[PDB]
Amino acid sequence: KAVTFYEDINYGGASVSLQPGNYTLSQLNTAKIPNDWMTSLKVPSGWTVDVYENDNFTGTKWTYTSDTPWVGNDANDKMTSVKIYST
Ligand SMILES: [Ca+2]
Ligand SMILES: [Ca+2]
């Protein structure tokens, strides 16, 4: 089980899976996840994903605790850093 971030709505386009952790922008990029690119994501039930507008877990924070086929226009293409918890 893991969190999978997708480039497009409805889990379309490019996708990358990550385990729990605290990922900065440069770390996402290394994982092949570009800046301001996340549109949808699958989340293991019970897990928590805190998506941040800016790098180093700052800026606006959006939280997801389940598969989300459309993060919506407000959070769309804004992820720069993210914290994933298996709780
Ligand atoms: Ca996108
Ligand atoms: Ca951003």
Domains along the chain with CATH numbers? 1-87 (2.60.20.10)
Q: Write the DSSP string, 40-82.
A: EEE--TT-EEEEEEETTTEEEEEEE-S-BS--HHHHTT--SEE
| Neighbour count for residue 37 (Cβ, 10 Å) | 19
Contact present, 76 and 35 (Cβ < 8 Å): no
Ligand 1 centre and the CA of 36: distance in Å?
Answer: 7
Answer yes or no: is 74 a known binding residue. no
Q: Comparing C-alpha atoms, which of 42, 43, 52 is closest to residue 83?
A: 52
At a CB cut-off of 8 Å and minimum separation 6, what does 22 contact? 57, 81, 82, 83, 84
Which of 77, 14, 17, 66 shows the shortest CA–CA distance to 43? 66
Please say whether the beta carbons of 18 and 49 come within 8 A: no
Whole-angstrom distance, CA of residue 50 vs CA of residue 24? 12
The DSSP bridge partners found for residue 37 are none
Question: How far is ligand 1, taken at its centre, from the CA of residue 70, in Å?
Answer: 10
- Count of residues in the chain: 87
Technique used to solve these coordinates: X-ray
